[PDB]
Amino acid sequence: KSKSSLDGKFSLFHTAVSVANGFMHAGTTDNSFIKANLPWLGKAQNWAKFTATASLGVIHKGNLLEGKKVMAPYLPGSRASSRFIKGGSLYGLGLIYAGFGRDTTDYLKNIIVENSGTSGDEDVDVLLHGASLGIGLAAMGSANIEVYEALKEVLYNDSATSGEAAALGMGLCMLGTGKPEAIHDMFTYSQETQHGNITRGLAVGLALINYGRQELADDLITKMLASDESLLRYGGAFTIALAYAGTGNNSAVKRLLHVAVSDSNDDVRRAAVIALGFVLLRDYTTVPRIVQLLSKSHNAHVRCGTAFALGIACAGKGLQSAIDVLDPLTKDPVDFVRQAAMIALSMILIQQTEKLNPQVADINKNFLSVITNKHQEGLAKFGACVAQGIMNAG
Amino acid sequence: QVFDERIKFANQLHDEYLVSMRYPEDKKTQQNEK
Amino acid sequence: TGRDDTKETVYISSIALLKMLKHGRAGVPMEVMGLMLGEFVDDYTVNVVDVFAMPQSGTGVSVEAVDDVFQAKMMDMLKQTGRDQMVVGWYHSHPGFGCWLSSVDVNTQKSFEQLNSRAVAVVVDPIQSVKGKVVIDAFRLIDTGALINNLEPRQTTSNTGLLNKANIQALIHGLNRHYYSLNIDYHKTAKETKMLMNLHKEQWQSGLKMYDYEEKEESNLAATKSMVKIAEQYSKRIEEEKELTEEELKTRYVGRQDPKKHLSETADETLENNIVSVLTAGVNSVAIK
Amino acid sequence: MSLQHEKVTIAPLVLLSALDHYERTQTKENKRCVGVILGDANSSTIRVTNSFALPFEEDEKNSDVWFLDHNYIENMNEMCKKINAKEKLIGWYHSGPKLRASDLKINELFKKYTQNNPLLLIVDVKQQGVGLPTDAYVAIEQVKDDGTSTEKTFLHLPCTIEAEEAEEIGVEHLLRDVRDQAAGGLSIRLTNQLKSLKGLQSKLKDVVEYLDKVINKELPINHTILGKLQDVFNLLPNLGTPDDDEIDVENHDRINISNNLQKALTVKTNDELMVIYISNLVRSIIAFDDLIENKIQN
Question: Is C219 found in the same domain as C95?
């Protein structure tokens, strides 16, 4: 039903189905659907194709036996249609090989140290984008400093496209070290770089690297939120999110309510509300009380952030209090408030029967209605589609 | 000096009013009604 | 090829913005134009530092208005100030319409695209603007081959983009056909901000300045005496307060022309005035002697 | 030439612009920039519409030595008039930070072009003070006897501003602030008053140290200045005067009116309390009955 309503030529309408398809078949092989509806897959182009090739690894999470073999045509160096297939192949390889990824790290590194000296055409840029997502995944938690330096050279070599990937790539590799060396370079270089995407990467990156730090992270947070740049404040929010993860905190909440009210730049206003979700997963029945008040706020951004907070927060067993907050928001006219709500609903009510509670059934039906309607705008259509695939985990 | 007492008494009456006014209205609003 | 062809988010600086408002309001209702000097970075971040203005011509913005003589002369002078840079597009104003390119402006645009491949046309409507925030939209031509084969999703990659619907279907179609509207954002500095903020050098004087005293006496009598008359009207108001439904009272016996509101307004207005008066005079007396 | 210069109002764009120009020529480290100021005059009100940079080289060693390309100013100008006849060459801006006697040489050159006395607009780029860092000075030539025969001098004129409507919506659109130079409501005006005091305190300090330098570092005695300070002390208010009593009586009237206004408002609030409470009494009767009917419906 999803495939029939939603057309391949549009980049977006292809993305929604593909990620969701992967989710349904996640944790085990099954490309039967992909083969039947192969013409559909091919109509994608640009970054929607990068998604499609990465989606193979979602399906194939786990399986290490056919792990390299199945992605083997698509790997660079071998025939391919386009540059995107080649870039996302390394990205999907890492998903499959994740959590035993020691091997792949060896492979993917060769390509980074290859290209760090100079870079040609666009072909190499999209390759190298894919390469740095790959390494992150393969090396996750390994905190290899020799890898940190390589990545750093991707930023200085300054193909704008690869810059986004390398930034995220660092934080995935280095998680938790709060390595004082790294923190200083990343902060200075965000001012200096002007390309949006590189700055957007490092902002998240400075947050990621201080993980489990807690009270030692105290220093990082103040400076980032104090900056004039909207971008460092966006990363600022999440510095609180990652460092204080997992433990209720009085300090952490207050800073976050204050930011969401006191700052006009709208992206940042959304980012602090998101942040609340992670910190308070310790007593998850406090989340519905905390965001109750903020959901009243008419700033739209604050509202989209409210949904995500509960999504993160109640992700195991469902909580009735949480659902009351999101029922007005499924119905809000603001297009991305609805998208975050529907998405959020599936991550809470993952793996809950439709027989024990009628509300999980109704919520599945609602998603299906949005998808058939063309009266609806595409951003809701994508939100509905992604949600069903989380619920049925394939 | 005479006016200081007059004014200070007056201001205290406005504060008492504010605090009292909102409380009743919450109770009925929660309760079922048209 | 793989070229994203990511459409330009226009980061228009604070200085550029004010200059265009100024140029455009004066020409009302004729269309005004001139060019945008800037730098293009990334693949979607076109930074407009400043604009320079073309003399207004009788043709209401046309390719003719692009005059090579005016251009050479103005640019050579900007070289001496180092303020010569690349042409990253053209501004214009539609002030008599909402933001959208007509046919004439499409030909103007077309010549612009040969010049420079990421030339934008940023339409400043500076009076009809339905929001307090100046409704401004940015456009760039998209070629027909690409449109017919629906490569248009490919042009909208890496941009959240921006919604322009007020002319519904027509508006949407026009926008698409032209280029696609993108976010306009403002890069300001705290040096610039401070300058705009201060706007009163006679602050230090004026707050120690107190009004000549014959006018204060006059005013106080007026205010008290006037409230005697709005109190009589107050009495009338609360004779009623019995009709069923507050709203029904306001319609049936014409409860508007509300004495309550005039006495409250007046009392507060006079109140603050007297607070400042007693403070100022009393401060002066001790500071100075 | 003209006496018509009695107020200067300056568009927010002029102040903004001059500051930007300073760094787009890259003159810094105590290097001046001079640019042409374009706009309306020949009127009591001067309205500086716009500004443009002029190539400038500053040499610290000799202040008898400077570069300003004369021919550039004139070409650039004439194109500007055809867009808008509103702009005339009305003078030149100077980047500060202070008045100079080396500003006078520059002054003479620009006086050839002008039909009014050039306005000399000091936009200080050190951005000092709680007021504008912009002083306005028009070159007056007056016959004066103090040993000198005819003085030419730069006289302060006050600074105010004016803004066009379109430009004004643009200023608020940038700011998230509701502004505080407004002289708005009761909060704002108390704020400004406190600013006005802190302002005064500084000015007086600066007077104190001038006198010091004359009696310790032997700046030559300038009689004119001391003459004025003499009056400042002669027209000083004094205590023990029946003048003071009058002000005290006056004060009594003003508290009488405040007292009455405040009491009027106690009534207004009391009236609100009761009103909302009738509305609650109605709501309870409705609420009893609704509940009863809901029992039937269930």
Answer: no
Tally of CB atoms within 10 A around B25: 14
Contact A47 C158 (CB under 8 A): yes
Q: Are D268 and C264 an interchain contact pair (Cβ–Cβ within 8 Å)?
A: yes
What is the H or E stretch that residue D52 is in? Answer: strand D45-53
Q: What is the 3-state secondary structure (H, E, C) of C61-77?
A: CCHHHCCHHHHHHHHHH
Structure tokens that stand for A67 in this block? 């792990």
Exposed e or buried b per residue across A103-116, where buried means at least 16 C-beta atoms within 10 angstroms of its C-beta? ebbebbbebbeebb
- C19 and C154 co-located in one domain: yes
Distance CA A288, CA A265 (A): 25
In-domain check, residue C76: yes
Q: What is the DSSP string of A304-363?
A: HHHHHHHHHHT-SS--HHHHHHHHHHHT-SSHHHHHHHHHHHHHHSTT--TTT-HHHHHH
Helix-then-strand count for chain C, H and E: 11, 7
Do C249 and C150 sit in the same domain of this protein? no
> What is the b/e burial string over A146-179, where b = at least 16 CB atoms within 10 angstroms of the residue's CB?
ebbebbbebbebebbbbbbbbbbbbbbbbbbbbb
Chain C CB contacts of A9 under 8 Å are: 150, 153
Residue range of the domain that includes C221 = 212-289
- Nearest Cα to Cα of residue C61 among C87, C29, C39: C29
Q: Check: CB of residue C258 under 8 Å from CB of residue C237.
A: yes
Q: In angstroms, rounded to a whole number, what is the distance separating the alpha carbons of residues C174 and C161?
A: 16
Q: Using beta carbons and an 8 Å cutoff, which residues of A are at the interface with C?
A: 9-12, 45-48, 82-84, 122-123, 126, 160-161, 194-197, 228
* DSSP assigned state of D117: P
Beta carbons within 8 Å of D255's beta carbon, 6+ residues apart: B3, C278
Which residue of D255, D279, D287 is in closest CB contact with B32?
D287
Residue whose pair of structure tokens reads 């529907």 in the numeric block: A342
Tell me the chain A residues in contact with residue C43 when contact means C-beta distances shorter than 8 Å.
Answer: 160-161
Q: Based on the domain organization, do C217 and C90 belong to the same domain?
A: no
Assign 3-class secondary structure to C176-223. HHHCCCECEEEECCHHHHHHHHCCCCCHHHHCCCCCCCHHHHHHHHHH
Q: Among residues C186, C201, C226, which one ends one of the domains?
A: C186
Q: Do C18 and C99 fall into the same domain? A: yes
C177 and C34 in one domain? Answer: yes
Enclosing H/E stretch for D134: strand D134-145
